Amino acid sequence: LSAEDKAAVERSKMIDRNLREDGEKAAREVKLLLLGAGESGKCTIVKQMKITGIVETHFTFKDLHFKMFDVTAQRSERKKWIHCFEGVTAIIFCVALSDYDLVLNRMHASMKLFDSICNNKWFTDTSIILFLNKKDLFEEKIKKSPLTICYPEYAGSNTYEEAAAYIQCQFEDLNKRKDTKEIYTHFTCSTDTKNVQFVFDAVTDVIIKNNLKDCGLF
Amino acid sequence: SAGYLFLDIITYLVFAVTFVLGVLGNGLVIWVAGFRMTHTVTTISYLNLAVADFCFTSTLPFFMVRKAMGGHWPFGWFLCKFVFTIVDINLFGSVFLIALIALDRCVCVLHPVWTQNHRTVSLAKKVIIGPWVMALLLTLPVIIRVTTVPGKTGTVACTFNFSPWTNDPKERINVAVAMLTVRGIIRFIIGFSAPMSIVAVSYGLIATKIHKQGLIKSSRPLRVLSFVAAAFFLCWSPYQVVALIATVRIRELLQGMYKEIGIAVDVTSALAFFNSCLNPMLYVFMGQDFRERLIHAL
Amino acid sequence: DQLRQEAEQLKNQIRDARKACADATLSQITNNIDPVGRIQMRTRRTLRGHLAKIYAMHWGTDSRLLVSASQDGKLIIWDSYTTNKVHAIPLRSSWVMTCAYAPSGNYVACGGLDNICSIYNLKTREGNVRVSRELAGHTGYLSCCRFLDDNQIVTSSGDTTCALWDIETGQQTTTFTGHTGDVMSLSLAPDTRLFVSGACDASAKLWDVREGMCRQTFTGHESDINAICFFPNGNAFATGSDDATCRLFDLRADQELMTYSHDNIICGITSVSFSKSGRLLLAGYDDFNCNVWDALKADRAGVLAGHDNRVSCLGVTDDGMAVATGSWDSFLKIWN
Amino acid sequence: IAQARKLVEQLKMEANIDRIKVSKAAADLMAYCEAHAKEDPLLTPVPASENPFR
C-alpha cells in the first residue's frame, strides 16, 4: 500500500517543485497585449527593434523580460476569448494616424474598438499604452487632406503641432474611468531604441501601481 | 499631587484593550492569510508579522499577572524563562519585520526591475529567516541569564541576575551594571538606529519618487505610509530614548532609588506594546482587499 | 429575395410541425413523481497545483484520472483518489481554452488561442511526455475538443466550423460548415455515432461523425451557447447560454422540454453536465458558484458554493461517483 | 448566393425526420432515470464504506 503510493507522492512532489519554479519564471515575465484596427501599423512596431493563431514575441530590455502578443491575426468574437488576457500588465494599442480618411471610417472603427476595450470588465485596473503609428506620413498627409474629413466637430489649424495633440486628447477621453487606467500616449519615431524605451518607462509605471496595490499603499 | 494611581489605571486599561483587540485581529489575520488567501510575498510577510505579534499578545497575560502582583512572580522559573525569551523574540521579530517590509516597499518602488525579476515567494522565504535568526542571536544573552532570583522581603521577581554565583554584592552590582549598560547600548543601536532610520528613509524615498513622477492619483498611498511611520515612531522612539537614559544612569538606577525612571520605563513599555496590537489595524486591515476577504470569510 | 422567402417559408413550416407535435408540457408529465433531488453536497477533495486560472477539464473512463488546463502553460493529469499529480505536461502556448482525455487514457488533447490541437501521449517508453501530433489546420481559437476513439478526434474552433481529425493522418477528414456563429462547445453521444455543437449564434446543430451531415438545428436560446452535454441515455441534451437559462432538448420532439430559469440569477451559464442517471443536472454559473437542477422537475435541487471565482468547466465521472469543478482561482475541487 | 442556396437545401432536406410524441418522449426520458436511480451515487448518498472519496 505504502510502496507504490510513496513513489507516486514523490513524483507529484518532484514535479510540483518544477511547477513552482516555472510559475516563478512565468510571473517574472511581463505581459503586453496588442490589438487595433491598424493591422499594418502593428507590424512596424514589432519589426522596429530586434528581439497560426496568435504570435508571441519575447525579448529583454534593460534586464526586464518582456513578452509581446500579436492578437490582430485572430479574427473571432472578442468577448469569447478576451478574458484570457485579464492578467496582462499593460495593453499596447497601435493605431495609424493617417487612417482618418480611409473607408475600409477606419479611425472610427479603431475608436469603437478603443471604447469597447476600455469599458471591458476584465481590464478595469489594466492601464493601456497608446502608440500613434505613421507619424511621419501623418504630417505629410494632413497638408493635402484635412483632418476634419471624418471629424464632424473639428475647428483648428491643420498643422502637426496641434493635430497630433487633438488625436491624443480624443483617444484619452474615451475612458469611462480615469483613475484605475492611465493611458501613455507616445509618438512613434524612426529610432529603434526610442520606440521600446517608452514601453519600458510605461511598464515601469504600471509595475509601480501593481506593487502599490499589492503592498496596500493605494 | 500624585497621579500614580491614574497612571496605573491607564496602563491596565491599555494592556487589557491591547490584549483583546490584538488577539482578535491577529487570529482573524492568521486565519485569512493561511487558509483564505494564497501565499504571496506581502501575504507571507503579514502572516509572519501576525504570528510574531500574536504570540506576544498571548503571552501578555503573563505580564498582567506579574504587574498585578508587583514584584512577586507567582509562576515557575522555567515558565518565566520561556516567557521572557519568547516576548523578546516576538518584539525583535516585529521590529525587524517592520523594517523588512519598509525595505521591501522601498525596493519595489525605487527598483521595479529588481522586484519584478528576483522578488518571489522563494526569495521571500529565504529572507524571512534572516530577522528571526538575528533576533535569536541577540536574545541569546536573555536565555543565558534571566533566572528568577528571589527577594529578602518575600517577593520573587524575574530579572537579569548577571552572575550565577554571587562572590560579593558589590561585585555582583558592578557586573550587572556593566552587562545592563552594554546590553542597553546594543539594544538601542540595533532597535532604533538601523530599523527606525531604515523605515524613515524608505518612506521618504517612496514619497519623493511618488511625488517627482506623478504616480499617485490619490492621497491614500502617502497617508498610509505617513500613518504607519508616525505610529511606529510614537510607539518606539520614546521607549528607546527612555531606555537609553536609564542605561546612562543604570549604576544609580540599580541602587534602588529613581522610581520615577522606573515608572517611565513601564509606561514606555506599555506604549511600545501597543504597537504590537495596532500593527494589524494599519498594515493589514487598511487594505481594501484584506477587509473584503475578511468580510466574505466571516 | 425569392430564395430568402423560401427559407422563411421553410422556417415557418418546421416550427408549425414542432408546435403541432407538441401536446403538453414535458414538466407536467413529471409533476406527479416524488422529487428526490434534495441532497447535501460537500467538498470531498481539493486540488491545488495550478498557478493560473483553469479554463477546461475532463474526466476519465476509469473515473480516477482527470485532466486540467490553465493559463500558466501546464497541462496536469490528476489522480482523483490520491490527489497526487500523475503528469504535468508543459504547453508551448500558455493561452489554452479546452482539453480532452482519451477514453482509453493513451492520449490527451489541448487547444487554445494558438489554434493548434496539440495532442500528447501519456503511455510512452520515455519518462517525459512528448508531443504526439499538432493539428494545425484551424483558423479561429479552439473552444472544445473531444476524443471519440484513440485515432479520431473532433475539435470545435472559433472559425464557425468544426472538424474531425485523425491523429495518425493529421488532416481534417470531415468538416462541419453548417454553423453561422463561433462554436463554443462539443458533446459526444454515448455511442459516439453523433454529436451536437453550440455556437455563438444562439443555436445548437446536431452532426454526424460518419456522414458529416447536419441532421437538425435547435434555436431555443437568445444568447450564445457556452456548454453542452448529451443525456446519459443519448436521446436528449442540454445547452447552457449566457442568458442565465439552460434548456434541455430531445432528439425527437425537438423543442424546449424543460427550462431552468430563476429570477435571482442573471449571470451567464458556463458549464452544463449530467450525472450517471441524468435525474439531476449539474450547471455552472458565472456568479462564483455552480448549481444543481432537477432534470425532470425543472427546479434547483441544491446550491454548490465552494469556489472563490467563476466556474470554467465541470464534469461528472463516468460511473457518476463524484463531480469535479474547476474555477479561475486555480483550484479544482472534487465534490460528492 | 451559394451559401444561401446551401442553407435552403439543408432546411428542406431535414424536414423529413421521424417525430415522436412529447409525452412519450418525456416518459422515455424519465424511464431511464428511474431504471438507473438505484445505481445513482449522486441521487442516493453512498455510504463511506464503499465510497472512494472520504
Numbering used by the authors:
A (entry chain A): 5 to 55, 182 to 234, 241 to 354
B (entry chain R): 19 to 316
C (entry chain B): 5 to 340
D (entry chain C): 9 to 62
List sentences quoted exactly from the publication behind this structure.
In response to the N-formyl peptides from microbes and mitochondria, FPRs play crucial roles in host defense and inflammation. Although FPR1 and FPR2 share 69% sequence identity, these two receptors display distinct ligand-binding preferences. In contrast, FPR2 is promiscuous in ligand binding with recognition to a vast array of ligands with diverse sizes, structures and functions, ranging from small molecules and lipids to peptides and proteins, which enable its involvement in chronic inflammatory diseases such as AD, systemic amyloidosis, and atherosclerosis. In this work, we determined the cryo-electron microscopy (cryo-EM) structures of FPR2 bound to Gi and four peptide agonists with diverse sequences and lengths, including Aβ42, fHN, and two formyl peptides, N-formyl–MLFII (fM5, derivative of bacteria-derived formyl peptide) and N-formyl–MYFINILTL (fM9, mitochondria-derived formyl peptide).
